[PDB]
Design a protein around this ligand. Structure first.
Ligand SMILES: *[C@@H]1O[C@H](CO)[C@@H](O[C@@H]2O[C@H](CO)[C@@H](O)[C@H](O)[C@H]2NC(C)=O)[C@H](O)[C@H]1NC(C)=O
Ligand SMILES: *[C@@H]1O[C@H](CO)[C@@H](O[C@@H]2O[C@H](CO)[C@@H](O)[C@H](O)[C@H]2NC(C)=O)[C@H](O)[C@H]1NC(C)=O
Ligand SMILES: *[C@@H]1O[C@H](CO)[C@@H](O[C@@H]2O[C@H](CO)[C@@H](O)[C@H](O)[C@H]2NC(C)=O)[C@H](O)[C@H]1NC(C)=O
Ligand SMILES: *[C@@H]1O[C@H](CO)[C@@H](O)[C@H](O)[C@H]1NC(C)=O
Ligand SMILES: *[C@@H]1O[C@H](CO)[C@@H](O)[C@H](O)[C@H]1NC(C)=O
Ligand SMILES: *[C@@H]1O[C@H](CO)[C@@H](O)[C@H](O)[C@H]1NC(C)=O
Ligand SMILES: *[C@@H]1O[C@H](CO)[C@@H](O)[C@H](O)[C@H]1NC(C)=O
Lengths: 127, 248, 252, 50, 127
């Protein structure tokens, strides 16, 4: 079975940076793209970023452009989200999702569904 | 393999049994151009390439001479004088699953059409505009490949189909791919029209007393005349007596 | 080192049975009493055919390589007997500078005291391998006698060959398109042979198609002086013909 | 495309000189009789020119 | 001009049978095959059946095999579709098309284009 495991979440002061990691085990060749989403209590899950597994092209949500960066290590089958300039609005559970549907248009990954999801990791920005 | 990366198996130095194919009832399309599948058993070819790939049902028509489309132009192209065969059968039970199998891809963008039996497996970002993409996707910069929506509930046209194209080749080389050409039973002590491995004649085949060597096949007389042969199946030597004749 | 190819290098040119008869045939044979190179893994040409011979008491020699470059640039033949098994490959193999043995593939097959003679030729894309094994009591050079080589392998490779090498003493000769008379006994085996171009007596034997000719005078051949030089005489002119004016004419 | 002109695509044997075959019999490409029914190994012998 | 006119459509209860007729006027000799298609609101037109004008060999879609039968009267230059065991899924506009392209393989008529089409007739299966 394809397993996604998030890690790196924790308490941070506003203005800092934190690198969340998401490891994928099981199927590797079929990975088409890896996405990061976040959800705050009482709020709907929202798209944060996406990256094509091959090539590494990235697509970012406007709310995190210039602060968050999504990358991936194919050898380790891992996807990393470097969140810089942490804000109190960033406090949420961050999940990573995997999709095997290869789409020519990168922006499609900002709205198309993902078939695999991890358990998520909590991130809290106090001050 | 995917249509954009169709695999190519090479067949050489073996007996090509075409009966198992054209008589099989598991093939929906078994088209052939300028060649009959039955006549292949009578023919020999230097090499035989089986190009294998999966395409959706409605794209199966593009695999043929004088065809156009995504598959015909960017993924797989055939020549206008193709003289092989194209076989295709549904693979919904194999190439589909609940949720949608996306393991089969196809090239969606390319700067020009493909050539006969040309394979493009590049993943370069397609530059739709005048701005170089430099390996970065965005506006007028898309990924040339896209997945297939193969689901068990999809329509027949959209359901997966496995396709094999058989191309034959004749180089300046020996033809190592021949048919089986099944034999017949043997009759002795009668005037018959015999055809052995590479020779033919009319005569009477009789149990002989000669001693061929293990590698010797057909005997000869003083005047370069065939007097004896070795049966290819049974290692028994047969003398050939001309059918009785004479003046009246 | 050179040695004498007394009467060896004869192979059954076809798989035909002939009994108690003399057959004349033109094909690639080893000229009798010719010089054969003697070695105790250099690269050798493959001009038109090869007669290889090896004397063994410990199975030092193991195989052969054939091709044009033998540097993983094109197809090449590798034939190797390793200790229990024969192997034949035609892959574009990358070889070492001095290959040896210690103590894109289009075909693949798997199977002094002794003398092993082999004949390798390549015609019409087919690689013909004949061979013959025998016991011997000799250590200096080849034994004098006569023995024919039955065919063993016929490979439809369609591969060019102009060079070859051996993989482990032995002897090497190069075949030539000569006419031979072969004496088939009642059992189809070749017991004696004659090289129709060695000496006049052999020309006579082949003309009569007999190994023992009766006394007399026989008209065998025709002597012709061969040209030593080629003469080309043309009038000494220097003016290029104006074909451009016609082909490069603007208007037709 | 004009499809009024046709050509015969299958026949159990080649025509003799100046022979004329206008039959529309179903061509039995296999061992199973067609009985005038088209299908697997049962093909209509004629086909139109494009 | 070649004119195709459908008729026979109407309201039917599920489980009944209805014979749709399609008359062809104009060119007759050039008729190579006659096909029946159907289209439901909001759905793509789909192939129902086909019949070779000469010989009468028929080719049916899997969805109607064992229920629908296609025949033709050459003297009347008409093609008939007997739809048995009517289902609610059969509610649609049924069109008849004519092709002059003679194809050796009958199944080709299940996907090859038709140059002539009728106006269609509505069929509704309530219950
Ligand atoms: C070629 O195939 C035939 C058919 O199998 C082999 O026939 C057998 O031959 C042996 C030896 O004579 C008999 O004892 C068997 O009874 C034969 N079987 C049958 C079914 O007739 C034959 O040996 C094969 N030859 C080679 C060289 O493979
Ligand atoms: C000589 O080398 C060949 C291969 O170069 C060996 O053959 C292999 O044997 C194993 C075990 O039976 C098979 O699984 C392989 O398929 C064989 N190779 C090929 C190419 O078929 C052979 O074993 C070697 N000889 C000895 C004595 O070990
Ligand atoms: C061909 O080979 C056969 C078999 O080896 C030879 O026949 C034998 O000849 C010896 C000598 O007279 C006899 O003692 C045997 O009884 C024979 N056996 C058989 C089966 O015939 C024969 O002499 C050989 N002929 C030639 C010309 O070499
Ligand atoms: C053949 O070999 C002998 C012995 O080495 C040598 O003397 C002779 O010159 C050689 N033949 C020619 C043509 O040189
Ligand atoms: C590999 O073999 C094929 C055989 O058809 C040949 O066409 C091709 O050139 C070969 N490749 C190389 C690198 O020689
Ligand atoms: C084989 O050798 C001949 C003669 O040297 C040469 O003309 C020919 O090009 C060679 N074949 C190939 C495929 O290179
Ligand atoms: C004709 O002109 C072309 C270039 O204009 C030249 O290459 C060619 O050689 C000329 N014709 C002949 C016969 O030389």
């Amino acid at each position: 079975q394809v397993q996604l495991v998030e890690s790196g979440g924790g308490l941070m002061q506003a203005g800092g940076s934190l690198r969340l990691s998401c490891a994928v085990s099981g199927r590797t060749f079929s990975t088409a793209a890896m996405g990061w989403f976040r959800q705050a209590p009482g709020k709907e899950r929202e798209f944060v970023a996406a990256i094509r597994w091959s090539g590494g092209s990235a697509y970012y949500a406007d709310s995190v452009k210039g602060r968050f960066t999504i990358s991936r290590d194919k050898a380790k089958n891992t996807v990393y989200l470097q969140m810089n300039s942490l804000k109190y609005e960033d406090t949420a559970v961050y999940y990573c999702a995997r999709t095997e549907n290869v789409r020519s248009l990168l922006s499609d990954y900002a709205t198309w569904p993902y078939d695999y999801w991890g358990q998520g990791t909590q991130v809290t920005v106090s001050s | 393999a995917s249509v954009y990366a169709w695999n190519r198996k090479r067949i050489s130095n073996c007996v090509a049994d075409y009966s198992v194919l054209y008589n099989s009832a598991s093939f929906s399309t078994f088209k052939c151009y300028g060649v009959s599948p039955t006549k292949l058993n009578d023919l020999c070819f230097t090499n035989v390439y089986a190009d294998s790939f999966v395409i959706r049902g409605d794209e199966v028509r593009q695999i043929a001479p004088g065809q156009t489309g995504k598959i015909a132009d960017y993924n797989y192209k055939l020549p206008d004088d193709f003289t092989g065969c194209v076989i295709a059968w549904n693979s919904n039970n194999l190439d589909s699953k609940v949720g949608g199998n996306y393991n089969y891809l196809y090239r969606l963008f390319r700067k020009s059409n493909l050539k006969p039996f040309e394979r493009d497996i590049s993943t370069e970002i397609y530059q739709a505009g005048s701005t170089p993409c430099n390996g970065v996707e965005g506006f007028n910069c898309y990924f040339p490949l896209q997945s297939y929506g193969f689901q068990p509930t999809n329509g027949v046209g959209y359901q997966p189909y496995r396709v094999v194209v058989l191309s034959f080749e004749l180089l300046h080389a020996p033809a190592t791919v021949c048919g089986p050409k099944k034999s017949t039973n043997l009759v002795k002590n009668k005037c018959v029209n015999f055809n052995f491995n590479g020779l033919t004649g009319t005569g009477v085949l009789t149990e002989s007393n000669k001693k061929f060597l293990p590698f010797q096949q057909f005997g000869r007389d003083i005047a370069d005349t065939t007097d004896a042969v070795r049966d290819p199946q049974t290692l028994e030597i047969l003398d050939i007596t001309p059918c009785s004749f004479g003046g009246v | 080192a050179y040695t004498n190819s007394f009467t060896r290098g004869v192979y059954y040119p076809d798989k035909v049975f002939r009994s108690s008869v003399l057959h004349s045939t033109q094909d690639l044979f080893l000229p009798f009493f010719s010089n054969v190179t003697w070695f105790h893994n250099p690269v050798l040409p493959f001009n038109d055919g090869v007669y290889f011979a090896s004397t063994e008491k410990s199975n030092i020699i193991r195989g052969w390589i054939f091709g044009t470059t033998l540097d993983s640039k094109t197809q090449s033949l590798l034939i190797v007997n390793n200790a229990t098994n024969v192997v034949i490959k035609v892959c574009e193999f990358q070889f070492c500078n001095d290959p040896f043995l210690g103590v894109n593939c289009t075909f693949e097959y798997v199977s002094f005291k002794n003398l092993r003679e082999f004949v390798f030729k390549n015609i019409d894309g087919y690689f013909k391998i004949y061979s013959k094994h025998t016991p011997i009591n000799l250590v200096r050079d080849l034994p004098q006698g006569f023995s024919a080589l039955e065919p063993l392998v016929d490979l439809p490779i369609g591969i060019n060959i102009t060079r070859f090498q051996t993989l482990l003493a032995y002897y090497v000769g190069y075949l030539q398109p000569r006419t031979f008379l072969l004496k088939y006994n009642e059992n189809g085996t070749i017991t004696d042979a004659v090289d129709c171009a060695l000496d006049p007596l052999s020309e006579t034997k082949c003309t009569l198609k007999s190994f023992t000719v009766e006394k007399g005078i026989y008209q065998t051949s025709n002597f012709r002086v061969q040209p030593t030089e080629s003469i080309v005489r043309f009038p000494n002119i220097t003016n290029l013909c104006p074909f451009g004016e016609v082909f490069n004419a603007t208007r037709f």
